[PDB]
A paper describes a structure:
In Escherichia coli, the glucose-specific transporter IICBGlc serves as the major glucose transporter and functions as a component of the phosphoenolpyruvate-dependent phosphotransferase system. Protomers can be divided into an N-terminal (TM1-5) and a C-terminal (TM6-8) functional domain, representing the central scaffold domains (SD) and the peripheral transport domains (TD) in the dimer, respectively. In summary, the structural elements and the observed conformational states exhibit typical hallmarks of an elevator-type transporter, suggesting that IICGlc utilizes this mechanism for substrate translocation.
Utilizing nanodisc reconstitution in lipid bilayers, we successfully captured the IICGlc transporter in two functionally relevant conformational states: (i) a symmetric dimer structure with both protomers in the inward-facing state (IF-IF), and (ii) an asymmetric dimer structure with one protomer in the inward-facing and the other in the outward-facing state (IF-OF). In the IF conformation, the position of the substrate binding site relative to the membrane plane faces the cytosolic side, whereas in the OF conformation, it faces the periplasmic side. In both conformations, OH-2, OH-3, and OH-4 form each multiple hydrogen bonds with neighboring amino acids, including E202, R203, K257, T297, and E298. A major difference between the IF and OF states is observed for the glucose OH-1 binding, which is coordinated by the F337 carbonyl oxygen in OF and by the N215 side chain in IF. The ring oxygen atom is weakly coordinated by H211 in the IF state. Considering the size of glucose (~4.7 Å for O-1···O-3 distance) and the narrowest pore diameters of ~3.6 Å, the glucose-bound states obtained by cryo-EM likely represent the substrate-bound outward-facing, occluded (OFoccluded-holo) and substrate-bound inward-facing, occluded (IFoccluded-holo) states. In the IFoccluded-holo state, these involve M17, H211, H212, E298, and crucially, F146’ from the CL of the opposite protomer. Consistent with the physiological role of IICGlc, the glucose in the IF state, awaiting phosphorylation by IIBGlc displayed enhanced stability, remaining bound throughout the simulation in two replicates.
Author numbering:
A (entry chain A), B (entry chain B): 4 to 386
The structure:
Amino acid sequence: NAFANLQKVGKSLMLPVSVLPIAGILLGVGSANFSWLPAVVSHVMAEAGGSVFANMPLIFAIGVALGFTNNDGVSALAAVVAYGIMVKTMAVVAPLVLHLPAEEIASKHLADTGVLGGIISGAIAAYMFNRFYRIKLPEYLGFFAGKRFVPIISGLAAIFTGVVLSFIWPPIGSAIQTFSQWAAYQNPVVAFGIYGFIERCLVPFGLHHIWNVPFQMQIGEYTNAAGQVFHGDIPRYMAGDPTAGKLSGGFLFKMYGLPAAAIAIWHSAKPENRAKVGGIMISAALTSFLTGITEPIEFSFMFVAPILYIIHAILAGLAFPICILLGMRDGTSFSHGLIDFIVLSGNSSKLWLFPIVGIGYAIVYYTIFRVLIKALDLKTPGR
Amino acid sequence: NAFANLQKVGKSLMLPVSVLPIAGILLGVGSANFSWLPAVVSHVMAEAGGSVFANMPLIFAIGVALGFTNNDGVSALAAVVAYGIMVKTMAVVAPLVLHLPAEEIASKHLADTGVLGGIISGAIAAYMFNRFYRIKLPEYLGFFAGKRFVPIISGLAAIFTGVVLSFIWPPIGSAIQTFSQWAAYQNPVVAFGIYGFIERCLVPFGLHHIWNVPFQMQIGEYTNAAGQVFHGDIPRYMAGDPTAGKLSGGFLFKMYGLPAAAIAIWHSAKPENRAKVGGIMISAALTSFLTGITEPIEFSFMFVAPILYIIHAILAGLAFPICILLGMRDGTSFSHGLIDFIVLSGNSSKLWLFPIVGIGYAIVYYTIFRVLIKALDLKTPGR
Ligand SMILES: OC[C@H]1O[C@@H](O)[C@H](O)[C@@H](O)[C@@H]1O
Ligand SMILES: OC[C@H]1O[C@@H](O)[C@H](O)[C@@H](O)[C@@H]1O
């Protein structure tokens, strides 16, 4: 059941992403320094959003623990304990292993685990909960027995894992740093084209959350004037990173093409199966256009027309290079929709080109889908 | 149902306490600087325990949220978000309200909420979960609907509450600071005598957790060489505070008298109801002697012999002044037992007097219970 196990990783890694909108509303608006809001309000909102982003590794740990424990809050408490213990164990052991000052390591994040550390801590907590949450102790130790024993063993395992990972990290950490530097600053064009293609390829099976975690949460490192450091395209754009927003190509298809593809599916639908198909597809198009959720649109032609899905994946992969080359920069919280498009427009660049290239993308999607449905006789909804 | 509501507060405030043993094992041993352990091991364990104690307000928020949401992990995630948002909102607004530098406020903790802030955040998260965890949104916004909407509204409410409390705190905070200073440094004798008496009076109904939260977690302020600041007798003793350990009077009755009271109950039991009574009471005595859990012993004579319970409460209240005056200093993690007595003995003082005064307390309890059962015909277990 490896395939199902991988899915639970995707769902568990999605939950930390679902709480980004509150960070986007606060940090996105606050960092924009809108003239129609007092500076105090913007500063407070920015600080609140930065607080939300400072706990992202802990939120990931909680997500993993809840995903692998049927959403039990004691597992979340164990994840908190284990994440704290592991982070402090690594921070105190790594200077000894590397024989370098702790301050330099912290500043350069040589031993920093971040989201991966949160995932490891949450996995430890989930395993300890699943094994020991029914542990029977001697009658005179019955108090610590059960869910009460989970945090203690989780913390012990956490300190052990902290020592082990303080020994193990340097190589994998250097590899991760090199990959992040490449994909963020050296060749972001091909990097994010591949990201888009692989994400569309993985969306059918739920692994796109796993594939997104690096690009959305880890690659890149931006520090604001307050000294807080952000990792990933999403937090870095919300924080106000001029180099972020490389995921802006999501808008081009999510808000224009997939809705245009749905419109094409509606039009190509038979008249006897046209009204209901149009209702379903307009609902899906509105969903993808406002929130950015593509699954109602993509699942319609995911299996019946694999050729259409491959063409969509290629176009989506090309969307990100198009925006990067054209300078179109606008970020999202969870998925690329109109709400995120407007709320997060404060730090955007060339926001006017988005409707233009979007109309182009809609025309391309509509024409391609209509032509290939007529030619290849693809059985899109309503057939 | 106010009485039941108060109970849920006690249970919810107990859960943060139940994860103290891992802090006690690590911080208690690590801070002791035992010669039979390498300095590196002790330092690592101390840092891990300090990490556990740094998140105590967050652990309290999670406890409240889980207690008032039937232990749902999404409520814990909402509590994390809300606690972070509220803490940074207060830290950024209070300097404006008080017109004082933020650094001075943070150092002196003038606007610090701590455990109370965690409780407030957890209450916000629990209320928002209970109200909105079934919220129905427009079909095109269905993604944010449900448990996904709880963290966003919880964070908004958290920032609003942060502003309100940054306005409201100074008076109540000054009152709390004065009470803590008094009970910790000015008249700890009467303070902890009253604490013991009221704790024994509230144990029957579960409010003793609420009554303990201030003394255990808030009164006092100790900072170690690492710069971490601890609040409450328990963390301060674990950290190595010479002035802490005022709860050491718990041992005198929990490990000696209540077990001695159980032995007296066994002896006074009728021969036909003596073997099983002795088994039950020896199990209870072992529980209270090792872990410190008094409920098995106290509930035996709680209702049948209210006079005995009142005498026990008075003796327990006198226990803490006795230790304070005699200098007997030894701390606990959750309750006063032999495991905590040994593990946390590294920072103890006059550990030799504990068995002596304990034998005295056992003699007193045994004599009093036997005499009053023979005289007043109190129907202790086995009658
Ligand atoms: O699965 C929900 C959403 O997750 C986002 O990260 C993806 O970009 C979208 O394509 C998807 O609809
Ligand atoms: O209720 C469990 C335990 O809680 C502790 O805080 C009290 O000191 C004990 O008397 C009690 O047995």
